Protein backbone atom coordinates (compact mmCIF):
# COMPACT_ATOMS: atom_id res chain seq x y z
CA UNK A 1 0.00 0.00 0.00
CA UNK A 2 1.51 3.29 1.16
CA UNK A 3 4.72 1.52 2.21
CA UNK A 4 4.99 -0.09 -1.23
CA UNK A 5 4.56 3.29 -2.93
CA UNK A 6 7.20 4.81 -0.65
CA UNK A 7 9.59 1.95 -1.44
CA UNK A 8 9.02 2.38 -5.18
CA UNK A 9 9.64 6.13 -4.91
CA UNK A 10 12.82 5.49 -2.92
CA UNK A 11 14.00 3.00 -5.56
CA UNK A 12 13.33 5.52 -8.33
CA UNK A 13 15.20 8.23 -6.42
CA UNK A 14 18.14 5.88 -5.81
CA UNK A 15 18.27 5.05 -9.51
CA UNK A 16 18.11 8.76 -10.34
CA UNK A 17 20.95 9.67 -7.98
CA UNK A 18 23.07 6.78 -9.26
CA UNK A 19 22.44 7.86 -12.86
CA UNK A 20 23.31 11.51 -12.21
CA UNK A 21 26.44 10.51 -10.28
CA UNK A 22 27.50 8.28 -13.18
CA UNK A 23 26.84 10.97 -15.81
CA UNK A 24 28.71 13.64 -13.84
CA UNK A 25 31.44 11.03 -13.34
CA UNK A 26 31.79 10.57 -17.11
CA UNK A 27 31.87 14.32 -17.71
CA UNK A 28 34.40 14.85 -14.91
CA UNK A 29 36.37 11.89 -16.27
CA UNK A 30 36.81 13.68 -19.59
CA UNK A 31 37.59 16.93 -17.77
CA UNK A 32 40.13 15.28 -15.45
CA UNK A 33 41.65 13.51 -18.46
CA UNK A 34 42.34 16.88 -20.04
CA UNK A 35 43.44 18.16 -16.60
CA UNK A 36 46.01 15.39 -16.09
CA UNK A 37 47.11 15.89 -19.70
CA UNK A 38 47.77 19.55 -18.88
CA UNK A 39 49.52 18.43 -15.69
CA UNK A 40 51.82 16.22 -17.78
CA UNK A 41 52.13 18.83 -20.55
CA UNK A 42 55.08 20.65 -18.96
CA UNK A 43 57.69 19.71 -16.36
CA UNK A 44 58.98 21.88 -13.51
CA UNK A 45 62.41 23.06 -12.45
CA UNK A 46 63.97 20.41 -10.17
CA UNK A 47 63.42 21.61 -6.60
CA UNK A 48 66.50 20.27 -4.84
CA UNK A 49 65.23 21.84 -1.58
CA UNK A 50 68.82 22.33 -0.43
CA UNK A 51 69.30 22.75 3.32
CA UNK A 52 70.10 26.46 2.93
CA UNK A 53 73.47 27.09 4.61
CA UNK A 54 75.14 26.29 7.94
CA UNK A 55 74.58 29.44 10.03
CA UNK A 56 75.47 31.92 7.30
CA UNK A 57 74.79 34.95 9.52
CA UNK A 58 75.75 33.21 12.76
CA UNK A 59 72.16 33.37 14.04
CA UNK A 60 69.91 30.85 15.78
CA UNK A 61 69.48 27.51 14.01
CA UNK A 62 66.52 25.15 13.84
CA UNK A 63 66.17 22.09 16.07
CA UNK A 64 64.24 19.48 14.09
CA UNK A 65 64.11 16.72 16.72
CA UNK A 66 62.62 13.90 14.68
CA UNK A 67 60.46 11.68 16.88
CA UNK A 68 61.59 8.57 15.00
CA UNK A 69 65.21 7.40 15.27
CA UNK A 70 66.82 10.17 13.21
CA UNK A 71 69.44 12.80 14.10
CA UNK A 72 68.21 16.32 14.78
CA UNK A 73 68.54 18.56 11.72
CA UNK A 74 69.90 22.09 12.12
CA UNK A 75 68.95 24.97 9.80
CA UNK A 76 69.49 28.72 10.39
CA UNK A 77 66.21 30.56 10.97
CA UNK A 78 65.93 32.79 7.91
CA UNK A 79 63.95 35.63 9.49
CA UNK A 80 61.75 37.63 7.12
CA UNK A 81 61.09 41.36 7.21
CA UNK A 82 57.91 42.67 8.81
CA UNK A 83 55.30 45.01 7.35
CA UNK A 84 53.11 47.75 8.79
CA UNK A 85 49.75 46.52 10.08
CA UNK A 86 46.37 48.25 9.74
CA UNK A 87 43.60 48.94 12.30
CA UNK A 88 40.68 46.53 12.22
CA UNK A 89 37.35 47.37 10.59
CA UNK A 90 34.57 45.71 8.61
CA UNK A 91 33.12 46.23 5.15
CA UNK A 92 30.49 48.95 4.76
CA UNK A 93 27.99 49.93 2.08
CA UNK A 94 28.49 53.35 0.45
CA UNK A 95 25.44 55.58 0.67
CA UNK A 96 24.30 59.19 0.32
CA UNK A 97 20.56 59.25 1.19
CA UNK A 98 18.68 57.59 4.03
CA UNK A 99 17.23 54.10 3.63
CA UNK A 100 14.31 52.90 5.77
CA UNK A 101 14.91 49.18 6.30
CA UNK A 102 11.68 47.22 6.67
CA UNK A 103 10.88 46.41 10.29
CA UNK A 104 -9.10 37.85 -11.26
CA UNK A 105 -5.87 38.96 -9.59
CA UNK A 106 -5.51 42.00 -11.86
CA UNK A 107 -6.26 43.37 -15.32
CA UNK A 108 -4.20 42.59 -18.44
CA UNK A 109 -1.83 45.04 -20.09
CA UNK A 110 -2.78 47.26 -23.02
CA UNK A 111 0.71 46.54 -24.34
CA UNK A 112 0.53 43.42 -26.48
CA UNK A 113 -2.25 41.93 -28.62
CA UNK A 114 -4.27 40.74 -25.61
CA UNK A 115 -6.35 43.71 -24.45
CA UNK A 116 -9.91 44.26 -23.27
CA UNK A 117 -12.12 46.74 -21.41
CA UNK A 118 -12.16 46.90 -17.60
CA UNK A 119 -13.26 49.87 -15.48
CA UNK A 120 -14.36 48.34 -12.18
CA UNK A 121 -12.16 50.66 -10.11
CA UNK A 122 -11.52 52.68 -13.28
CA UNK A 123 -8.78 51.70 -15.74
CA UNK A 124 -6.07 53.39 -13.61
CA UNK A 125 -5.22 50.96 -10.81
CA UNK A 126 -1.55 49.98 -11.11
CA UNK A 127 -0.03 53.48 -11.16
CA UNK A 128 -2.28 54.86 -8.39
CA UNK A 129 -1.72 52.17 -5.74
CA UNK A 130 2.07 52.27 -5.41
CA UNK A 131 2.93 55.96 -5.12
CA UNK A 132 4.77 58.52 -3.00
CA UNK A 133 4.16 62.19 -3.83
CA UNK A 134 7.12 63.24 -1.68
CA UNK A 135 9.98 61.49 -3.50
CA UNK A 136 8.09 60.69 -6.75
CA UNK A 137 8.88 56.99 -6.41
CA UNK A 138 6.94 53.78 -7.00
CA UNK A 139 7.06 51.62 -3.86
CA UNK A 140 9.82 53.72 -2.35
CA UNK A 141 12.12 52.69 0.48
CA UNK A 142 12.57 56.20 1.90
CA UNK A 143 8.92 56.56 3.01
CA UNK A 144 7.76 53.12 4.17
CA UNK A 145 4.39 54.30 5.45
CA UNK A 146 1.29 52.21 6.08
CA UNK A 147 0.41 52.31 2.35
CA UNK A 148 -3.32 51.69 2.68
CA UNK A 149 -3.49 51.22 -1.09
CA UNK A 150 -2.51 47.64 -1.91
CA UNK A 151 -2.68 44.93 -4.59
CA UNK A 152 -2.39 47.44 -7.47
CA UNK A 153 -5.96 48.62 -6.86
CA UNK A 154 -11.26 73.26 -16.31
CA UNK A 155 -13.33 75.69 -18.36
CA UNK A 156 -12.48 75.79 -22.06
CA UNK A 157 -13.92 77.15 -25.28
CA UNK A 158 -16.18 75.01 -27.45
CA UNK A 159 -14.59 73.27 -30.44
CA UNK A 160 -16.95 74.58 -33.10
CA UNK A 161 -16.49 73.72 -36.80
CA UNK A 162 -14.85 70.49 -38.06
CA UNK A 163 -11.36 70.88 -36.57
CA UNK A 164 -9.20 69.28 -39.24
CA UNK A 165 -11.44 66.34 -40.07
CA UNK A 166 -15.12 66.23 -39.09
CA UNK A 167 -15.51 67.29 -35.46
CA UNK A 168 -18.12 66.08 -32.98
CA UNK A 169 -19.48 69.57 -32.31
CA UNK A 170 -19.76 70.37 -36.03
CA UNK A 171 -22.35 67.58 -36.30
CA UNK A 172 -25.89 68.88 -36.73
CA UNK A 173 -27.49 69.03 -33.29
CA UNK A 174 -25.19 67.29 -30.82
CA UNK A 175 -23.53 70.00 -28.69
CA UNK A 176 -26.81 70.73 -26.92
CA UNK A 177 -27.24 66.98 -26.42
CA UNK A 178 -23.82 66.82 -24.76
CA UNK A 179 -24.72 69.80 -22.58
CA UNK A 180 -28.02 68.19 -21.55
CA UNK A 181 -26.31 64.88 -20.78
CA UNK A 182 -23.72 66.63 -18.61
CA UNK A 183 -26.46 68.58 -16.81
CA UNK A 184 -28.52 65.43 -16.21
CA UNK A 185 -25.56 63.88 -14.36
CA UNK A 186 -26.33 66.12 -11.36
CA UNK A 187 -32.61 68.11 -33.70
CA UNK A 188 -30.52 66.86 -30.71
CA UNK A 189 -28.52 63.88 -32.01
CA UNK A 190 -31.44 62.68 -34.11
CA UNK A 191 -29.23 61.58 -37.01
CA UNK A 192 -28.27 57.87 -37.01
CA UNK A 193 -24.67 57.18 -35.95
CA UNK A 194 -21.96 55.18 -37.67
CA UNK A 195 -20.96 51.59 -36.89
CA UNK A 196 -17.21 51.12 -36.35
CA UNK A 197 -15.67 48.32 -34.31
CA UNK A 198 -13.96 49.50 -31.12
CA UNK A 199 -11.31 47.34 -29.47
CA UNK A 200 -10.96 46.90 -25.72
CA UNK A 201 -7.72 48.87 -25.52
CA UNK A 202 -9.14 51.76 -27.55
CA UNK A 203 -12.34 51.71 -25.49
CA UNK A 204 -10.46 51.81 -22.18
CA UNK A 205 -8.07 54.54 -23.34
CA UNK A 206 -10.91 56.69 -24.68
CA UNK A 207 -12.94 56.17 -21.49
CA UNK A 208 -10.06 57.19 -19.22
CA UNK A 209 -9.06 60.17 -21.37
CA UNK A 210 -12.66 61.41 -21.62
CA UNK A 211 -13.12 61.01 -17.87
CA UNK A 212 -10.00 63.11 -17.32
CA UNK A 213 -10.72 65.59 -20.15
CA UNK A 214 -14.52 65.67 -20.55
CA UNK A 215 -15.98 68.05 -23.13
CA UNK A 216 -12.83 68.53 -25.24
CA UNK A 217 -12.98 66.50 -28.44
CA UNK A 218 -10.40 67.71 -30.98
CA UNK A 219 -7.51 67.11 -28.56
CA UNK A 220 -8.73 63.68 -27.42
CA UNK A 221 -9.18 62.71 -31.08
CA UNK A 222 -5.64 63.95 -31.78
CA UNK A 223 -4.12 61.85 -29.01
CA UNK A 224 -6.26 58.76 -29.76
CA UNK A 225 -5.80 56.35 -32.66
CA UNK A 226 -8.20 57.00 -35.52
CA UNK A 227 -11.27 57.90 -33.43
CA UNK A 228 -13.19 60.33 -35.60
CA UNK A 229 -14.75 62.97 -33.36
CA UNK A 230 -18.25 62.23 -34.65
CA UNK A 231 -17.65 58.61 -33.69
CA UNK A 232 -16.39 59.87 -30.32
CA UNK A 233 -19.75 61.58 -29.76
CA UNK A 234 -21.47 58.40 -30.98
CA UNK A 235 -19.73 56.32 -28.30
CA UNK A 236 -20.37 59.01 -25.69
CA UNK A 237 -24.09 58.81 -26.46
CA UNK A 238 -24.12 55.00 -26.64
CA UNK A 239 -22.39 54.53 -23.28
CA UNK A 240 -25.02 56.69 -21.59
CA UNK A 241 -27.69 54.68 -23.41
CA UNK A 242 -26.16 51.46 -22.06
CA UNK A 243 -25.58 52.95 -18.60
CA UNK A 244 10.36 65.74 19.76
CA UNK A 245 10.22 67.19 16.25
CA UNK A 246 8.55 64.87 13.74
CA UNK A 247 8.68 64.85 9.96
CA UNK A 248 5.83 66.67 8.21
CA UNK A 249 3.26 63.98 7.41
CA UNK A 250 1.01 65.29 4.60
CA UNK A 251 -2.74 65.55 5.17
CA UNK A 252 -5.38 65.41 2.42
CA UNK A 253 -8.76 66.94 3.27
CA UNK A 254 -10.16 69.62 0.93
CA UNK A 255 -12.49 72.26 2.38
CA UNK A 256 -11.48 71.30 5.92
CA UNK A 257 -9.45 73.47 8.33
CA UNK A 258 -6.55 71.83 10.18
CA UNK A 259 -7.35 72.66 13.81
CA UNK A 260 -7.52 70.08 16.64
CA UNK A 261 -8.60 67.46 14.07
CA UNK A 262 -5.47 67.13 11.89
CA UNK A 263 -2.37 64.96 12.37
CA UNK A 264 -0.14 67.95 11.56
CA UNK A 265 -1.69 69.90 14.44
CA UNK A 266 -1.39 66.90 16.78
CA UNK A 267 2.33 66.73 15.93
CA UNK A 268 2.89 70.51 16.37
CA UNK A 269 4.03 70.61 12.74
CA UNK A 270 3.18 72.92 9.86
CA UNK A 271 1.31 71.77 6.78
CA UNK A 272 3.67 71.64 3.80
CA UNK A 273 3.16 71.74 0.03
CA UNK A 274 2.43 68.00 0.04
CA UNK A 275 -0.57 68.64 2.30
CA UNK A 276 -3.77 68.75 0.24
CA UNK A 277 -5.76 70.91 2.66
CA UNK A 278 -7.13 74.35 1.82
CA UNK A 279 -4.56 76.85 0.56
CA UNK A 280 -5.57 79.14 3.47
CA UNK A 281 -4.94 76.48 6.13
CA UNK A 282 -4.23 77.65 9.67
CA UNK A 283 -1.14 75.47 10.17
CA UNK A 284 0.40 76.30 6.78
CA UNK A 285 3.93 77.59 7.23
CA UNK A 286 4.42 80.98 5.53
CA UNK A 287 7.48 81.02 3.31
CA UNK A 288 10.05 83.23 4.99
CA UNK A 289 11.01 86.26 2.85
CA UNK A 290 14.70 86.54 3.80
CA UNK A 291 16.86 88.86 1.70
CA UNK A 292 19.63 86.22 1.77
CA UNK A 293 21.53 83.49 3.61
CA UNK A 294 18.72 82.52 6.03
CA UNK A 295 21.30 82.11 8.84
CA UNK A 296 20.02 84.70 11.35
CA UNK A 297 17.60 83.59 14.11
CA UNK A 298 15.36 86.24 12.44
CA UNK A 299 13.97 83.71 9.89
CA UNK A 300 11.04 81.61 11.46
CA UNK A 301 12.56 78.55 9.77
CA UNK A 302 15.89 79.25 11.48
CA UNK A 303 14.25 80.28 14.76
CA UNK A 304 12.21 77.05 14.97
CA UNK A 305 15.00 74.66 13.86
CA UNK A 306 13.81 74.14 10.28
CA UNK A 307 15.01 74.24 6.69
CA UNK A 308 13.37 76.05 3.76
CA UNK A 309 10.85 74.43 1.42
CA UNK A 310 11.38 75.57 -2.19
CA UNK A 311 7.61 75.81 -2.74
CA UNK A 312 6.99 78.24 0.14
CA UNK A 313 10.19 80.30 0.51
CA UNK A 314 10.62 81.75 -2.99
CA UNK A 315 12.89 84.81 -2.69
CA UNK A 316 14.88 83.27 0.18
CA UNK A 317 16.87 81.35 -2.43
CA UNK A 318 15.87 77.77 -1.55
CA UNK A 319 14.16 77.23 -4.93
CA UNK A 320 16.07 79.18 -7.58
CA UNK A 321 19.01 77.48 -9.34
CA UNK A 322 18.12 73.96 -8.23
CA UNK A 323 20.85 72.39 -10.40
CA UNK A 324 23.77 74.20 -8.79
CA UNK A 325 25.94 74.21 -5.66
CA UNK A 326 24.71 75.07 -2.16
CA UNK A 327 22.05 77.77 -2.46
CA UNK A 328 22.36 81.26 -0.99
CA UNK A 329 20.05 80.27 1.87
CA UNK A 330 22.40 78.48 4.27
CA UNK A 331 19.40 76.60 5.73
CA UNK A 332 18.93 74.31 2.72
CA UNK A 333 22.36 72.71 2.14
CA UNK A 334 21.24 69.32 3.48
CA UNK A 335 18.51 68.95 0.85
CA UNK A 336 20.84 70.13 -1.93
CA UNK A 337 23.30 67.36 -1.03
CA UNK A 338 26.43 69.53 -1.04
CA UNK A 339 28.87 68.65 1.75
CA UNK A 340 32.59 68.59 2.53
CA UNK A 341 35.13 65.96 1.49
CA UNK A 342 36.35 63.67 4.28
CA UNK A 343 39.42 61.43 4.39
CA UNK A 344 40.27 58.18 6.16
CA UNK A 345 43.42 57.47 8.19
CA UNK A 346 44.45 55.65 11.38
CA UNK A 347 43.23 57.84 14.22
CA UNK A 348 45.79 59.38 16.56
CA UNK A 349 43.48 58.49 19.47
CA UNK A 350 42.12 55.04 18.60
CA UNK A 351 41.21 53.08 15.49
CA UNK A 352 40.14 55.08 12.45
CA UNK A 353 39.17 58.72 12.15
CA UNK A 354 37.62 61.00 9.55
CA UNK A 355 40.09 63.75 8.60
CA UNK A 356 38.64 66.72 6.72
CA UNK A 357 40.75 67.94 3.81
CA UNK A 358 39.41 71.52 3.93
CA UNK A 359 38.95 73.98 6.82
CA UNK A 360 35.47 74.52 8.27
CA UNK A 361 34.51 77.70 10.10
CA UNK A 362 32.14 78.15 13.05
CA UNK A 363 28.67 76.62 12.56
CA UNK A 364 29.19 75.37 9.00
CA UNK A 365 27.86 72.30 7.23
CA UNK A 366 30.43 69.51 6.89
CA UNK A 367 28.44 66.39 5.96
CA UNK A 368 25.12 64.66 6.56
CA UNK A 369 25.14 61.71 8.97
CA UNK A 370 23.17 59.36 6.73
CA UNK A 371 22.49 55.68 7.29
CA UNK A 372 19.47 53.40 7.56
CA UNK A 373 16.29 54.38 9.39
CA UNK A 374 15.29 51.83 12.02
CA UNK A 375 12.69 52.08 14.75
CA UNK A 376 13.75 52.47 18.37
CA UNK A 377 13.38 48.72 18.95
CA UNK A 378 15.26 47.86 15.76
CA UNK A 379 17.75 50.53 16.82
CA UNK A 380 18.20 48.64 20.09
CA UNK A 381 18.81 45.32 18.31
CA UNK A 382 21.19 46.86 15.76
CA UNK A 383 23.10 48.69 18.49
CA UNK A 384 23.47 45.50 20.51
CA UNK A 385 24.79 43.70 17.42
CA UNK A 386 27.26 46.53 16.74
CA UNK A 387 28.39 46.70 20.38
CA UNK A 388 29.02 42.94 20.35
CA UNK A 389 32.39 43.97 18.89
CA UNK A 390 32.39 47.24 20.89
CA UNK A 391 32.01 49.84 18.13
CA UNK A 392 28.61 51.51 17.74
CA UNK A 393 27.45 54.03 15.13
CA UNK A 394 23.91 54.68 16.40
CA UNK A 395 22.66 58.28 16.38
CA UNK A 396 19.35 59.94 17.22
CA UNK A 397 17.37 61.83 14.55
CA UNK A 398 13.77 62.19 15.78
CA UNK A 399 11.60 60.92 18.64
CA UNK A 400 10.78 57.64 16.87
CA UNK A 401 13.59 57.62 14.28
CA UNK A 402 17.20 56.50 14.74
CA UNK A 403 19.97 56.50 12.11
CA UNK A 404 22.47 53.63 12.31
CA UNK A 405 25.38 53.68 9.86
CA UNK A 406 27.34 50.51 10.61
CA UNK A 407 26.42 48.31 7.64
CA UNK A 408 25.52 51.32 5.47
CA UNK A 409 26.81 54.85 5.99
CA UNK A 410 29.36 57.40 4.82
CA UNK A 411 32.83 58.61 5.76
CA UNK A 412 31.30 60.79 8.50
CA UNK A 413 30.75 57.70 10.67
CA UNK A 414 34.37 57.79 11.91
CA UNK A 415 33.94 60.53 14.50
CA UNK A 416 36.17 60.56 17.58
CA UNK A 417 35.18 61.85 21.01
CA UNK A 418 36.52 64.32 23.56
CA UNK A 419 35.29 66.61 26.33
CA UNK A 420 36.23 69.55 24.06
CA UNK A 421 34.83 68.69 20.61
CA UNK A 422 35.56 70.71 17.50
CA UNK A 423 32.13 69.88 16.03
CA UNK A 424 28.49 69.57 17.05
CA UNK A 425 25.33 67.99 15.64
CA UNK A 426 21.99 69.67 14.95
CA UNK A 427 19.02 68.03 13.22
CA UNK A 428 17.04 70.15 10.74
CA UNK A 429 13.73 69.23 9.10
CA UNK A 430 14.19 69.48 5.32
CA UNK A 431 11.14 69.22 3.04
CA UNK A 432 9.10 67.28 5.56
CA UNK A 433 12.03 64.97 6.32
CA UNK A 434 14.56 64.84 9.15
CA UNK A 435 18.23 64.73 8.13
CA UNK A 436 21.13 65.08 10.56
CA UNK A 437 23.66 67.77 9.68
CA UNK A 438 27.16 67.94 11.16
CA UNK A 439 28.35 71.42 12.11
CA UNK A 440 31.76 72.66 13.23
CA UNK A 441 31.95 74.20 16.71
CA UNK A 442 34.96 76.44 16.00
CA UNK A 443 37.18 77.54 13.12
CA UNK A 444 38.80 74.20 12.27
CA UNK A 445 42.06 74.50 10.36
CA UNK A 446 43.01 72.11 7.59
CA UNK A 447 43.67 68.43 8.12
CA UNK A 448 43.09 67.70 11.79
CA UNK A 449 41.26 64.82 13.43
CA UNK A 450 37.69 65.85 14.19
CA UNK A 451 35.52 65.32 17.27
CA UNK A 452 31.91 65.04 18.38
CA UNK A 453 30.51 64.87 21.92
CA UNK A 454 28.91 61.44 22.32
CA UNK A 455 26.93 62.84 25.27
CA UNK A 456 24.58 64.52 22.78
CA UNK A 457 23.65 61.14 21.28
CA UNK A 458 21.93 58.25 23.04
CA UNK A 459 25.27 56.40 23.19
CA UNK A 460 27.45 58.65 25.36
Amino acid sequence: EYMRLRQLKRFRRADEVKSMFSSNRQKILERTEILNQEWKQRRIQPVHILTSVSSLRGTRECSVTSDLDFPTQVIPLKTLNAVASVPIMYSWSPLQQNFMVEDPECTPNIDGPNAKSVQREQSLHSFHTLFCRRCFKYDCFLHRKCNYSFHATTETALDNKPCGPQCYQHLEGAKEFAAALTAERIKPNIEPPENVEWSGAEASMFRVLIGTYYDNFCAIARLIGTKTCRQVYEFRVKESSIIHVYNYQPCDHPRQPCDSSCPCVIAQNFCEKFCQCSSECQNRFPGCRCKAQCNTKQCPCYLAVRECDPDLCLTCGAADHWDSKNVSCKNCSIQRGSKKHLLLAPSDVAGWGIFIKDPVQKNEFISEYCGEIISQDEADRRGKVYDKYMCSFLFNLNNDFVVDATRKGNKIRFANHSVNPNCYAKVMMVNGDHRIGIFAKRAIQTGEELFFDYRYSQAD
Partner: peptide, 16 residues
Protein backbone atom coordinates in the same frame (compact mmCIF):
# COMPACT_ATOMS: atom_id res chain seq x y z
CA UNK B 1 46.35 55.19 23.65
CA UNK B 2 47.85 54.35 20.27
CA UNK B 3 50.85 52.03 20.75
CA UNK B 4 54.26 52.52 19.16
CA UNK B 5 53.70 52.48 15.37
CA UNK B 6 56.48 50.04 14.46
CA UNK B 7 60.08 49.51 15.55
CA UNK B 8 61.71 50.27 12.21
CA UNK B 9 65.13 49.54 13.69
CA UNK B 10 66.00 46.02 14.91
CA UNK B 11 63.32 44.40 12.73
CA UNK B 12 65.97 42.31 10.95
CA UNK B 13 69.41 43.89 11.55
CA UNK B 14 69.66 42.96 15.24
CA UNK B 15 71.25 39.60 14.42
CA UNK B 16 73.62 41.21 11.90
Amino acid sequence: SLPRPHDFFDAQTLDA
